[PDB]
Design a protein around this ligand. Sequence first.
Ligand code: SF4
Ligand code: SF4
Ligand code: SF4
Ligand code: SF4
Ligand code: FES
Ligand code: ZN
Lengths: 688, 94, 106, 51, 125, 83, 47, 207, 114
Amino acid sequence: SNLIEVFVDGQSVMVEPGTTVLQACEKVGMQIPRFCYHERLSVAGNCRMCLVEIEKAPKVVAACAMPVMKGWNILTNSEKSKKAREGVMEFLLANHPLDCPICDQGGECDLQDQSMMFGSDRSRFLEGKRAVEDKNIGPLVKTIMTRCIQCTRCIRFASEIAGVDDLGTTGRGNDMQVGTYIEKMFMSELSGNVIDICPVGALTSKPYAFTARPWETRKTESIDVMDAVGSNIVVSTRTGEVMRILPRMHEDINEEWISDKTRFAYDGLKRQRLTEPMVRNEKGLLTYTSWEDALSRVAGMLQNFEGNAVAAIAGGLVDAEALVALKDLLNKVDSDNLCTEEIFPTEGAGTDLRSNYLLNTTIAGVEEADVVLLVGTNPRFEAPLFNARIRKSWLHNDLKVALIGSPVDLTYRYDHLGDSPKILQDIASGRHSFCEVLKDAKKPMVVLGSSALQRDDGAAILVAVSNMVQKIRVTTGVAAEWKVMNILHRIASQVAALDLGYKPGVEAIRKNPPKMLFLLGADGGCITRQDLPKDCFIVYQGHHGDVGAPMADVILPGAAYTEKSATYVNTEGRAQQTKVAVTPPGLAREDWKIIRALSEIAGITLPYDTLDQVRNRLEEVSPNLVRYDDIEETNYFQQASELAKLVNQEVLADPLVPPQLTIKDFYMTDSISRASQTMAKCVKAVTE
Amino acid sequence: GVQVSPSGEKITHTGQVYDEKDYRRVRFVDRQKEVNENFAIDLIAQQPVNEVEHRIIACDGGGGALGHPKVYINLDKETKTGTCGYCGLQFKQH
Amino acid sequence: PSGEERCIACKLCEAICPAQAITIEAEPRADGSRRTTRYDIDMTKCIYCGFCQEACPVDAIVEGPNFEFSTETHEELLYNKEKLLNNGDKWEAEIAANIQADYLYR
Amino acid sequence: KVSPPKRAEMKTSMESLIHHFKLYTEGYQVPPGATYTAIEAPKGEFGVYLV
Amino acid sequence: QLITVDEKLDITTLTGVPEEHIKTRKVRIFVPARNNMQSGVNNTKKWKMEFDTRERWENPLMGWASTADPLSNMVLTFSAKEDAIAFAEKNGWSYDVEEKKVPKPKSKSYGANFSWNKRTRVSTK
Amino acid sequence: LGLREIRVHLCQRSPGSQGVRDFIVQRYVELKKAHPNLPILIRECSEVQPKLWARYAFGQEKTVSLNNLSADEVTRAMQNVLS
Amino acid sequence: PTTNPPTARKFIWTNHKFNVSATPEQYVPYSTTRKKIHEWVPPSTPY
Amino acid sequence: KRPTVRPRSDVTHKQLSAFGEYVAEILPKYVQQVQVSCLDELEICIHPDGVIPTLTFLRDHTNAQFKSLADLTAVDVPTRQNRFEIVYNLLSLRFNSRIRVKTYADELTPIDSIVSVHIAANWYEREVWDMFGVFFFNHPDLRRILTDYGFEGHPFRKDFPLTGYVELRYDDEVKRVVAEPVELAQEFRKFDLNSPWEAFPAYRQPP
Amino acid sequence: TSVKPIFSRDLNEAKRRVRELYRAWYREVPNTVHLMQLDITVKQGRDKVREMFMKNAHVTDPRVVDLLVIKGKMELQETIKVWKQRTHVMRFFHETETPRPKDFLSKFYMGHDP
Ligand code: SF4
Ligand code: SF4
Ligand code: SF4
Ligand code: SF4
Ligand code: FES
Ligand SMILES: [Zn+2]
């Protein structure tokens, strides 16, 4: 049981010990006002706005921090608490500056709405205010500190979630100034979240600076496509444009937090973009033309070729509907060269047995763990929120992390197990120092990235890991349902690809250099015209001409994640649905729409003609993808282990350093990210 | 700053001018485009700094209830100077 | 009086405009200032109510005395920032006086 | 919180500026309920049933 | 007296809308997510029912945002979810329902910030 | 003409799919060894009636509804697909 | 204004203008904003 | 005594509660949920079958001579399965008082008409049919009033767009005021104004 | 199930009223093309009547059918009388709206709509 009967305005409610008054009242529906407490940060009763009387006690108590005692009535709308709130608002708004029309958190200010409900309507303040020196953090966070209410909701984030500890308070009295004592670029992969944390507009975003206002904005609940975390997101528009990004609340992923890319990379969706189908003319130059011309060229060339001479590279910012469409359209000209830019070993179960290329634990499952073992990853600069859940666990459920790779800051101490993949065998033997620690563990999880598998020994590394993992389950009998092996991706359009049946890598294309290439969103530089036949026909179905468009004989402008309803499977396997926010520009269209139109121009005329039909087709191939937000429990890891122990490929005597080593390498890893002024500014700041 | 483009159109303080191939230049045929010659950027630049004695002062427009809300500006920095959000006047202390 | 543009794109003249006549699109000016890149008024939607000038916190947009601005084209009655600033630079000698007379009531 | 403040009070006080802002952008959040109120308009009973 | 009508309640022949906005259209039933700027949650608590967005475009005169659909600024509110499914099935709209997202309860402690052994010992105050 | 993909669809807890799990844990390794280049996709869900799709050269897909089957009959029908 | 004249300002118009509705030098509306969605300019070389 | 707030009495509240008990116990076959508000406005809620008897009672009864129809509204609430809340505001002129009788309806659950009691209800029932789509039995005319003749739609329904589905303009090809579909040069800008804070705890909905 | 009627015990007794209404329209068209000088032939007017009837043939609820009959009687009243003008009647024909393309590839060539 271990329960407690508590009353709230008389009404009874049953809550555990260790709770507080704010949570007790939330169980009823009342939320007490607040400026310091967040529900994800350490408590600090510094605003003194959460003040409520108890029915017979002589004074008021901090409802954010006072734990609730047996036999209490919490009086929220009593005159004592209302007097307290009115006084606290008086004090807060005393030195606050009349900058509400300037301030970008204008129709978004908790101080406003709390003055409007829980506060007086008049100033009896007849003295001069103060004014505080402002700080130049960086190209994102615009500090105007004449209006900070000294709530410390930012230092706690920076210390407990970002793990930075470069933000504090200087002095005392009114003269206490939040921030650094020095000039320091607070430049982290979780830094734009302070803009949502700070209820006041003491710090805002520079890209959104002075642009729009919250009532103007329509809000479409979409998802992210930068990383494979699946961070739920709100895209805010204003008269057909995109103004800013914001987080959504999902507790299994994006725990109210998002990375700085996916909230300062929307700038890239309006630069170096594709708006018209372009075809190659007599002089060998691209020229804007119609849709019919381009699709007729493509289909004319397509009717001729059949089989090995038709390939496809899906990379990065690609749907699952587009993948299914291109897959069907190449199967119906009997070609199977459906490939993805990033390698994953096929030397065992391969893309069969979903458990092998998946976070078989959950991102929430990291909380229910005692040891974590990172291999070939820098989870900070790829899936940053996964590292954030790791740190949350590191704090509130004392966790010991290991690392195999290069020594790099993760925001916590990580027990560096050298730099080599022979240590995997050393562990699987049973002799390493780490097994003394791991035998005590009852719920571990190794998690290997899709950045060590891009090497020429990915299959061997996976076999070593699976062997180690099975010997680990043998050593520590964990459970009948606890997963230990996990795969971290950094690409949104990879899990759906491998689900549908795409073959990871490029090696089939180098093996059988085709006379065609469809290069779907493949603005990476893996394949080039120096590797392909003489008189090759490359068509690029995408956006953001970076390196994949200029090497193409025709172009088919596609749409971005902000501009189409689509599905993107994250690392866990959770399929998540985008919602159309803004239509794509020029003569740009959806991807699967283009493939179906090309098909009708040719003689295949694929059966489906709308979006529900393509979703049902996705059901036919992999029915995990129409299951939105419904994570599915895979199995059959033993089978993959038996099927992967068979092959025998040595592991090199080579260390494994990740590509994203410093923060310099984090802000530009994409097309949208590479075509962007804000990310370039952050790079300019870090490297100078 | 009413420099023109090579297409002959005046350019606004919001640098706006239509491209040469933009067909929307028709509407200025037998007509013109209204543009204000008095740019506020150059004008408020044509305004000196008001030196003061204190580290913290206030700013309204100058009429009181006819200007803008009272705001306070800190003048502890010496390399640069203060600036009002509403107006664009500047202040410094000796 | 310094010639500085008085609007700051606080974007509530269009919040309250009960005809949805006003649009604003705002940016920093390269001086580092909250200012507009757009201020349009469809004067064929305006109802001449005064809410915008009694909502502006800086006395930037006003509703002046000119009632003799009839036109032979619909497109002329769709204003922008430059036309409104022309009006202001034209009618300041009147509007300043009207404001001086009417304040202490508003 | 219902009727806007004086033009000078919203230029020296922060509270009254907040209230100006919310009144002139959002409104004042009348409670739920309903009424029928009638007056003698010069034609007759001018009535309004608000919800 | 009474009647035994079996078939699905259908109203589209009464509503006076075109076939286009009935069949082509898609509907999102949901509780809106809280604005992460404000810590308030009253803008939640009511199931809403929005429509799919459509092409907006720059008006060639002034640059205003134009439309060709009237359901753009469309929002309804329902105290529950089955009410919304009912209204949509009744008016002939294909719907996608996003389930209710509730934050996890959490164990707060102001004493964990001053521990002897744990990592919750915050270096600040 | 020739076979290009098989893909198996099943459930984790529903008993009608029982027979496919046993078939997998028994014969999947031997089958992959027999056909290593060939893929066979195994995608499971909460509540779906089992299937067994097979894709030949063109977009020629053919199914058998193996709901409430044994494991030996699953193997027999799968060999019928292969042959 | 011969006794209580108005304030002098650098930006006030000196010469008034009557109503211009059908003449030239009348008013024509236009978007004061700029290009938002920039296009991709392809290269001027082949391959 | 407080100036800013509105004065308050109790005798009107008590009178109207008494009359509510009166109607409730005199007319139980139909009556539901009598209620009196903070502002003293009596408000009786009625089963749709009880419309003529209740209205005839309040018109012709001696202690209730509600023989003047002020309004006859409707209110669309898409949530509840019986959408349209229909309202009957009345006054007496003998007791200097008002009352409000309420019923409910749906798209396919119409109501008897009231011209047999209040002839004033003719054009109001026509307006309600036009605006919300509530058919009224044994009505003489029951055609539109306010909408154009060739008009499909019940505009004041909450699921109806503000701007509509058709737009008019003259065409020289046919020399008529044709009706094209709707295409606006400026989309109506929906503003999200509601604050995320409980302003009135007295109306707090529990889960 | 278990709902009230309006004017119709069943669907056949509603089709009765439907046919009465079709009859009234068929007998009214020649008078409407004459009274207000429409520039169409009686054949295509009656074809329009049958078209706007078969626009709602999928329905099976008697109550919906009765309401449609009511609205048809309203429009017939408006048309028998000259409360509505040539504009309103020729509104039915859509003599200015280009045909919505009922094909995929045309929609793809113009617009993002399905
Ligand atoms: S934070 Fe901004 S909007 Fe809120 S009270 Fe301060 S100046 Fe006004
Ligand atoms: S900057 Fe913002 S979050 Fe940090 S203490 Fe000040 S008000 Fe709080
Ligand atoms: S005119 Fe006034 S109210 Fe309108 S945006 Fe400018 S400063 Fe704000
Ligand atoms: S006066 Fe005109 S522009 Fe100003 S708020 Fe009223 S309707 Fe809008
Ligand atoms: S919310 Fe409790 S003191 Fe700040
Ligand atoms: Zn100033």
